[PDB]
Ligand binder design. Structure first.
Ligand SMILES: *C(=O)[C@@H](NC(=O)[C@H](Cc1ccccc1)NC(=O)CCCCCN=[N+]=[N-])[C@@H](C)O
Ligand SMILES: [Cl-]
Ligand SMILES: [Cl-]
Ligand SMILES: [Cl-]
Ligand SMILES: [Cl-]
Ligand SMILES: [Cl-]
Ligand SMILES: [Cl-]
Ligand SMILES: [Cl-]
Ligand SMILES: [Cl-]
Ligand SMILES: [Cl-]
Ligand SMILES: [Cl-]
Ligand SMILES: [Cl-]
Ligand SMILES: [Cl-]
Ligand SMILES: [Cl-]
Ligand SMILES: [Cl-]
Ligand SMILES: [Cl-]
Ligand SMILES: [Cl-]
Ligand SMILES: [Cl-]
Ligand SMILES: [Cl-]
Ligand SMILES: [Cl-]
Ligand SMILES: [Cl-]
Ligand SMILES: [Cl-]
Ligand SMILES: [Cl-]
Ligand SMILES: [Cl-]
Length: 454
């Protein structure tokens, strides 16, 4: 089954490193293709013949419950576009340990491992990690910052689209995330590029490989393809108050006589500040509660109302032609990554991610809890003490004060709201260009509307 071959493949790679070091093979010698083939074959025979003890992070009751869940409820994914394939990884947020996974609908019918082997764009689940999370971390935005969703074009003249919408106007970060509007994510990433932020530094600390960081649609998942296991590791980082632990299934390999061939070594990395991570947790809580892009909270409330009252956060994604849907879920204890799609990349139904994957993942979450009642935990995500709280205008996401609007000094007042920041000073005073992004026309239409209201 999936677990046997995933474990065997990883143990063979660790045995390869061990044997080459044992036999004092130089890194140069190791570049020789014939030497490499010999050491791969030797590693395979050592595992096959050698009576090694492989210790995995797999919780057998949970992993077994996940296999029964996809066997019993995988048909809930079938949406009239043929048999829908699936990958899920359940990860301990404090360690990066993989407790269980779903490799696909049925190993016996299709052996492709959709948790560890298959790479697809994570689509709009990129946004919290690569755009908004980094912007907050760099003190370029807070929880109630305003972004432009006004119509705008990619460099090649194509409109930035969201379903059939060419865009609306100004909106909060919260609305931008709840809906997964695309234009606000585009502007956030353009701001990071313009400011020369080392985005690669963040993404590589979490083990992502992105070839071209200049892609305009990077936050929407253009120019990124990931395994479910890797992408689960990204969300583990946000859930774990910004501290990455490298994903692993193997914790140790020992010879029969107890000599250590390999032992996983924890190497925690603070990728985002605690302020940034805990702010993003609060935003991703509302993504699920708002139910705009996923029915997950409705599905889970019906299956298991007590589990639905755990502190769920997450994010959805849909690739361009609905070929791939994602739902990433966390409680403080665990992250569960979910992909669905077709092996031949053809389109899913329009609602496959919104409804079908949401219902299936509610069933998977329920099966995990029934197998291991305390595993999700009852702990809440909470704002770090280092978070800065700023009273800002609802209309500008910045502090009340004076702005020049067409000659005339204007006193900007009105509804205020607490905005969470991950810098020292918090939110700035309202300036004319108060939003992330927008044209001089957009600002003319945003200020008309705000001036109208004073
Ligand atoms: C996040 O899930 C958003 N998805 C997108 O914006 C995707 C990004 C993407 C595109 C291709 C591969 C991988 C990722 N793009 C679109 O949805 C664009 C829609 C098509 C409009 C242009 N029509 N044409 N031709 C989600 C919230 O939209
Ligand atoms: Cl398996
Ligand atoms: Cl496998
Ligand atoms: Cl176990
Ligand atoms: Cl893809
Ligand atoms: Cl434009
Ligand atoms: Cl909203
Ligand atoms: Cl970069
Ligand atoms: Cl990657
Ligand atoms: Cl670059
Ligand atoms: Cl591993
Ligand atoms: Cl031995
Ligand atoms: Cl910190
Ligand atoms: Cl809710
Ligand atoms: Cl709903
Ligand atoms: Cl309860
Ligand atoms: Cl989405
Ligand atoms: Cl297919
Ligand atoms: Cl809180
Ligand atoms: Cl404060
Ligand atoms: Cl303040
Ligand atoms: Cl500051
Ligand atoms: Cl900007
Ligand atoms: Cl303009």
């Amino acid at each position: 089954d999936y677990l046997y071959f995933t474990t065997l493949a990883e143990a063979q790679e660790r045995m390869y490193d061990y044997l080459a070091q044992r036999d004092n093979v130089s890194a140069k010698e190791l570049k020789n293709e014939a030497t490499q083939k010999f050491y791969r074959d030797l590693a395979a025979k050592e595992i096959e013949n050698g009576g090694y003890k492989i210790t995995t992070t797999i919780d057998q009751k949970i992993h077994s419950a996940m296999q029964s869940a996809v066997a019993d409820y995988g048909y809930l994914l079938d949406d009239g576009t043929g048999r829908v394939e699936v990958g899920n990884v359940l990860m301990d947020n404090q360690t990066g340990a993989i407790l269980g996974f779903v490799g696909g609908r049925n190993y016996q019918e299709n052996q492709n491992n959709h948790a560890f082997d298959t790479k697809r764009s994570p689509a709009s689940t990129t946004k919290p990690l690569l755009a908004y999370g980094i912007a907050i971390d760099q003190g370029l935005m807070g929880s109630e910052t305003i972004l432009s969703n006004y119509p705008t074009n990619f460099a090649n003249g194509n409109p930035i689209m969201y379903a059939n919408s060419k865009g609306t106007g100004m909106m909060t970060l919260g609305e931008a995330l709840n809906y997964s509007w695309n234009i606000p994510a585009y502007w956030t990433y353009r701001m990071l590029r313009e400011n020369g932020v080392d985005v690669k530094g963040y993404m590589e600390k979490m083990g992502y490989e992105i070839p071209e960081y200049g892609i305009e649609s990077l936050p929407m998942g253009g120019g990124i393809e990931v395994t479910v296991a890797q992408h689960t590791n990204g969300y583990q980082t946000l859930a774990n108050n910004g501290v990455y632990h490298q994903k692993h299934v193997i914790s140790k390999i020992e010879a029969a006589d107890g000599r250590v061939v390999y032992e996983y070594q924890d190497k925690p990395v603070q990728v985002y500040s605690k302020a940034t991570a805990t702010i993003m947790q609060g935003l991703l809580r509302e993504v699920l509660s708002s139910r705009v892009t996923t029915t997950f909270k409705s599905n889970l409330t019906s299956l298991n109302p007590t589990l639905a009252n755990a502190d769920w956060i997450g994010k959805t994604g849909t690739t361009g032609q609905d070929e791939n849907m994602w739902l990433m879920l966390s409680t403080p204890r665990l992250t569960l990554g979910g992909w669905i799609g077709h092996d031949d990349n053809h389109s899913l139904s329009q609602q496959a991610g919104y409804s079908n994957n949401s219902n299936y993942m509610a069933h998977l979450v329920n099966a995990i809890q029934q197998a291991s009642p305390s595993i999700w935990g009852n702990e809440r995500f909470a704002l770090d003490p280092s978070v800065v709280k700023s009273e800002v205008l609802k209309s500008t996401g910045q502090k009340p004060g004076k702005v020049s609007v067409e000659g005339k000094e204007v006193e900007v007042t009105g509804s205020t709201v607490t905005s969470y920041w991950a810098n020292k000073s918090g939110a700035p005073a309202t300036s004319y260009r108060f939003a992330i992004g927008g044209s001089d026309a957009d600002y003319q239409n945003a200020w008309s509307s705000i001036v109208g209201s004073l």
